[PDB]
Design a protein around this ligand. Structure first.
Ligand SMILES: C[C@@H]1CCC[C@H]1NCCO
Ligand SMILES: C[C@@H]1CCC[C@H]1NCCO
Ligand SMILES: C[C@@H]1CCC[C@H]1NCCO
Ligand SMILES: [Zn+2]
Ligand SMILES: [Zn+2]
Ligand SMILES: [Zn+2]
Ligand SMILES: [Zn+2]
Lengths: 69, 70
């Protein structure tokens, strides 16, 4: 039905929000510290000197283990 | 249809996986450092000395801003 299409859309959007904002291919699993934006995979986060959301300098990257992984 | 019921279940389970493992009510938004387990809300994480998943000492809690946050 149309509700199946709506739910497929919500599920897709929630899954897309768990993907890296830079490469769009790998799951987010990394946090820029100290700002706390958690928007990248480990490969993209290793290559950024400043946060792509707030432009704060990245002092270090913290790997995150999420139950959604 | 039955497909609608299946999708509603997947959506619900994914949303439940984003809730605090201690209170089950607030969204996960905190990370235990250095281990990196990110399974609690700010209130529940604030009073844990060791990680509830791996027992590593919590040196500090890092707040996390996630795109899934609602
Ligand atoms: C977005 C498309 C339009 C037609 C069918 C729909 N996808 C439904 C998946 O259940
Ligand atoms: C529409 C989403 C935003 C981030 C990832 C993208 N989907 C990419 C799938 O390869
Ligand atoms: C079934 C899920 C696991 C964690 C939270 C729980 N739902 C609680 C909603 O109030
Ligand atoms: Zn990436
Ligand atoms: Zn930032
Ligand atoms: Zn909690
Ligand atoms: Zn841990």
């Amino acid at each position: 039905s149309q509700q199946t299409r709506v739910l497929q859309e919500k599920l897709r959007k929630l899954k897309e929000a768990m993907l890296c904002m830079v490469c769009c291919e790998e799951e987010i699993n990394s946090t820029f510290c100290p700002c706390g934006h958690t928007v990248c995979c480990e490969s993209c986060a290793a290559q950024l000197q400043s946060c792509p959301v707030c432009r704060s300098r990245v002092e270090h990257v913290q790997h995150v283990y999420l139950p959604t992984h």
